[PDB]
Amino acid sequence: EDAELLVTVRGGRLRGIRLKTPGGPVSAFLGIPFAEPPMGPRRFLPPEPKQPWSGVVDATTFQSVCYQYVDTLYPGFEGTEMWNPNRELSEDCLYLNVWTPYPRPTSPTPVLVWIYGGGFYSGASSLDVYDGRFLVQAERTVLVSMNYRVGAFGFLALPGSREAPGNVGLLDQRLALQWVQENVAAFGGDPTSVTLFGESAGAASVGMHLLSPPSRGLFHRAVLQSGAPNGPWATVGMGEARRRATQLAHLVGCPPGGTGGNDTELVACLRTRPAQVLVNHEWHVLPQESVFRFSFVPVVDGDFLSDTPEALINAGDFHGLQVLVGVVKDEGSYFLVYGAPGFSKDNESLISRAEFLAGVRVGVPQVSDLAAEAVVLHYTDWLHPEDPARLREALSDVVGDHNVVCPVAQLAGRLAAQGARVYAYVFEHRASTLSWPLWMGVPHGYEIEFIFGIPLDPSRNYTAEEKIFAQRLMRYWANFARTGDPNEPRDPKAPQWPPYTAGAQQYVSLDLRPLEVRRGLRAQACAFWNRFLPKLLSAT
Amino acid sequence: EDAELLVTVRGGRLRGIRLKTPGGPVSAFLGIPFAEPPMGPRRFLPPEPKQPWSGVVDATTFQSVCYQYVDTLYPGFEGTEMWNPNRELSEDCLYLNVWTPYPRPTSPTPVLVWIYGGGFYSGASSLDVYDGRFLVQAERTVLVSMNYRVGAFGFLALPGSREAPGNVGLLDQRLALQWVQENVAAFGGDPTSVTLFGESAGAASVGMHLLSPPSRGLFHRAVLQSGAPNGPWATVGMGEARRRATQLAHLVGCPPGGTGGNDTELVACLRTRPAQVLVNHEWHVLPQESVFRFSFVPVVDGDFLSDTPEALINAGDFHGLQVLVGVVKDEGSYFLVYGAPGFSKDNESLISRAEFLAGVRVGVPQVSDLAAEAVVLHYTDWLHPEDPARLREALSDVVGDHNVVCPVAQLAGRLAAQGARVYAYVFEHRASTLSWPLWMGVPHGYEIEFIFGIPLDPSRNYTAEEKIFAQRLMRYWANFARTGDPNEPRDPKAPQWPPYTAGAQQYVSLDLRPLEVRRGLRAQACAFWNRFLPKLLSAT
């Protein structure tokens, strides 16, 4: 009972809180510090482990959200504000959360570790859609989720220097993984059965941990939902990361007018600026340059990532690894309202031929004019080259394929053909409570609410079929966490989920209907991006 | 005592509140309804007078702010969030506020009526900087301020139609003036000594009431601070107002796909949309245009304004009218951070030669390429054509002169030369508590806190010199409200404020020093805008 809400870890004692679900209680420990607050001189530096504390740290509520830009595209809209910070902003944000079933597991139980997304510039583990009380109750697994520094505070990089080495937001996640190895046993979790699962930039983070040797030894399985480290938005070069960091310093008045600016004086000037000042000038470091162009992302410096994610994926052995990858049916429609001309969530977004030609330049940035043409000519239905509805879905595919679906399919094929066991899915169910317009279909990020069993919340107006569908998805994710195989270990009644291989390229469709096997994660489209486009950009 | 907080008006009974000032108490009646809520079918329609109510309406706190865009340029910044709504948003917002001294004046007292600014798209009478408890206590005058519908709700116009006639936000102000005529006597105010004073779009509104016959009979004096009706941003043509209104309907999905769109079906579709939806698509009715191009402003339709404000000013008799006009020393610096390249409040904004050439295109929109050079060549110091600091102040002057200073000087000259007695000022004091950068000097809108005696608030950190300076400014404004002359009626010790004439063009400087008379409201610069530029734009 109340005795199970008291747990001692290597740093001290914690008091948790009991959460209610329609099927039983759950023990939650929200707000566990895993690192010293990275404030003052510790800004832009790798995280230091949290030193032990005296007394009982309160762990009954979520801690602060790391400083980040707040989306203001559609004020008062549920579809956008559900991803905005729901706690106060602070640099003191390195805290994690642990859910565990009641009664506490007596046997070592597999552990799921969630890494939120948000383009490496936003996100928090405290969002209502990441609530782990339903997944833990229904599947008796241990769920962990951490906060990591986003934006400039987590990924501003002056490569080579020691004051701003970059990738410190990735090190925050790694330190939280080392914390799980040393302390998850106190909650009834098996530190030898850890399964990372993330989404969007979280999925890219999960992939970058697979390609980093020090992080590979901290988990055993991986799940990448609608994201991958080899995406065109997920990394940046050393020279470009230096230009963006220097530009931000200029925007906030660094260095002072009559002064030199080596890497030491520049970061010293940045550390004196308030956090909100750095955030207010993040987006027009790249002006403008908003859609799929984030200013501060993981840098390829040679430390955390010894080479580019594409090179490490190709020249990598993945034997003894189980991966679960997947995307949603309409990956790009959510991002079109962020800068594509003629698009608006409040009308039908029936774009013209000229607006489609311009939209490709925003969804596929930094491409030659010849390469942009080849994209238009590949995605045009030449029997209906002027139909606005078809042009709308075409640009949605252009943006979804270039940024999400094809980097994932490229990764899933190389893993399965180099030792890894890979399962693939495509989420094709649109929630009955979805606030986005109908023409967006199944937007990016709207499978998370079903993985976490949010439809089981009695205060929400989901259908009965969606509740059963959410329970079936949670069993898929839990089975993969336990046995490395999403199929039920003994049930032959339900249709089977065949592994994804580089040849058959099999995946399943996740919706209210039973499982259906299909072949090809946009095989024809992704051949244009993964095979032809690097060839057209080679000979400029 | 508490008996003076009870007042009966022609509509019913009201209970006010006693406000504290360091020099004595003041009676305030905040939240008096002067019109029926313009919701449902009454959206976009002229206001109907508030029907009488039973009981005692509570008038102890400010009512709701009209639906409006919220500034998000610098989140958490005092300089911008002091103009954001400080109450909840609602279409039920047609309320006014009355301050009156304690004890209530027994004799008829002159009345000051405040009209807030905000580019006709924002603003509220509830902002802390518009608090009238200090002006009323120190000068024993009656202060009134109303809310009027801004944005599309106050100025969406389908000219000719009866469902969206336009200028209804100006009619809200007029109805509040009719209310003052019928009810200000109940508060101790003289309905025959009413002085309108506004700022920015408020000053433009005050000027448009001078040029509208039905509104001219509701006040006797006028004060225009940093704004004028003849400004390039303050009005719009009938055809352009129809294009902007139709574009907004398209952005919110009006009319539905298979449907025609005459002026009746279009506005009916608009009235079914939530208020926040119309606000979320207000700014990109004009795509990629923000600085001094507001989507919904007063329309020149022939009703409220029988002709353009420029035509009405030239062919108008102003005998028996006293006007007080003025600007701040740096009118344009505030607007540069809103879109001019190279500008940022957090650095020195030392722009290059190319950025100055591009900034003129944003500060002076919709002008020929030949006209843009004449602006550059007139504002370039050809001994230092590359000095960033001089180019910064140059673009600040370009924007300040074109939009504020010269439309005001054009108006002040025509008024003084056609019967009106005009006094002019230039506010040249930068507040010691100003949060904007130093290079902005005295930005637009930062004389309001001294007119309203805000430095007298003991919870604020103004200097002793600024407190005496605020009391001197309040006497200037109060004397003009009483006698139509800012000078003290019997004190010869302080320097005199000579009237502004079309020939001598005399004005005074308002700062910590005593009054100093000067000549010319940017006489050389405003000759370029008011005399030469129309000559270059005629012959394309």
From Swiss-Prot, chains A, B:
> Which Gene3D superfamilies does its entry note?
alpha/beta hydrolase
Give binding positions for huperzine A: 83, 130, 334
The entry describes its oligomerization and partners as: Interacts with PRIMA1. The interaction with PRIMA1 is required to anchor it to the basal lamina of cells and organize into tetramers. Isoform H generates GPI-anchored dimers; disulfide linked. Isoform T generates multiple structures, ranging from monomers and dimers to collagen-tailed and hydrophobic-tailed forms, in which catalytic tetramers are associated with anchoring proteins that attach them to the basal lamina or to cell membranes.
GO terms assigned for molecular function = acetylcholine binding; acetylcholinesterase activity; amyloid-beta binding; cholinesterase activity; collagen binding; hydrolase activity; laminin binding; protein homodimerization activity
Which gene underlies this protein?
Answer: ACHE
Q: Which domain of life is it from?
A: Eukaryota
The topology of this chain with respect to the membrane is: Peripheral membrane protein
Q: Which UniProt keywords apply?
A: Blood group antigen, Cell membrane, Disulfide bond, Glycoprotein, GPI-anchor, Hydrolase, Lipoprotein, Membrane, Neurotransmitter degradation, Nucleus, Secreted, Serine esterase, Signal, Synapse
Which residues are recorded as binding huprine W? 119, 200, 436, 444
Give the EC number(s) listed in the UniProt record.
3.1.1.7
Indicate what this protein is called per its UniProt record: Acetylcholinesterase
Which organs or tissues contain this protein? Isoform H is highly expressed in erythrocytes.
This enzyme catalyses: acetylcholine + H2O = choline + acetate + H(+)
- Species annotation: Homo sapiens (Human)
Q: List the disulfide bonds.
A: 66-93, 254-269, 406-526
Q: Which residues bind galanthamine?
A: 83, 199-200, 334
GO CC annotations on file: basement membrane; cell surface; extracellular region; extracellular space; Golgi apparatus; membrane; neuromuscular junction; nucleus
Q: Does the keyword Glycoprotein apply?
A: yes
Q: What result follows from mutating residue 172 to N?
A: Misfolding, absence of secretion
Cited Pfam families = AChE_tetra, COesterase
**By its UniProt entry, which SUPFAM superfamilies does this protein fall under?**
alpha/beta-Hydrolases
